[PDB]
Amino acid sequence: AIGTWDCDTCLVQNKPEAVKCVACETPKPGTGVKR
Ligand SMILES: [Zn+2]
């Protein structure tokens, strides 16, 4: 797993340290592959 993900619900990127997006606090689903 890369360990990094971007939030497309509000165009905001989050780093591995993040947990819940600041603008909308995304659940941060755990997915091995983004695609
Ligand atoms: Zn977001």
From Swiss-Prot:
Organism domain of life: Eukaryota
Zinc finger (RanBP2-type): 1-30
Bridged cysteine pairs (disulfide): none
Localization in the cell: Nucleus; Nucleus membrane; Nucleus, Nuclear pore complex
Coiled coil: none
Modification after translation (UniProt): Phosphorylated in interphase, hyperphosphorylated during mitosis. May play a role in the reversible disassembly of the nuclear pore complex during mitosis.
Binding residue positions for Zn(2+) 2: C7, C10, C21, C24
The protein's assembly and partners: Part of the nuclear pore complex (NPC). Interacts with TPR (via coiled coil region); the interaction is direct and provides a link between the core structure and the TPR-containing nuclear basket of the nuclear pore complex (NPC). Interacts with HIKESHI. Interacts with SENP2. Interacts with XPO5. Interacts with RAN; the interaction occurs in a GTP- and GDP-independent manner. Interacts with MCM3AP; this interaction is required for MCM3AP localization at the nuclear pore complex. Interacts with MAPK1.
Known role: Component of the nuclear pore complex (NPC), a complex required for the trafficking across the nuclear envelope. Functions as a scaffolding element in the nuclear phase of the NPC essential for normal nucleocytoplasmic transport of proteins and mRNAs. Involved in the quality control and retention of unspliced mRNAs in the nucleus; in association with TPR, regulates the nuclear export of unspliced mRNA species bearing constitutive transport element (CTE) in a NXF1- and KHDRBS1-independent manner. Mediates TPR anchoring to the nuclear membrane at NPC.
Family: Belongs to the NUP153 family.
Record's comment describing the protein's domains: Contains FG repeats. FG repeats are interaction sites for karyopherins (importins, exportins) and form probably an affinity gradient, guiding the transport proteins unidirectionally with their cargo through the NPC. FG repeat regions are highly flexible and lack ordered secondary structure. The overall conservation of FG repeats regarding exact sequence, spacing, and repeat unit length is limited.
Protein name: Nuclear pore complex protein Nup153
Originating organism: Rattus norvegicus
Organismal lineage: Eukaryota, Metazoa, Chordata, Craniata, Vertebrata
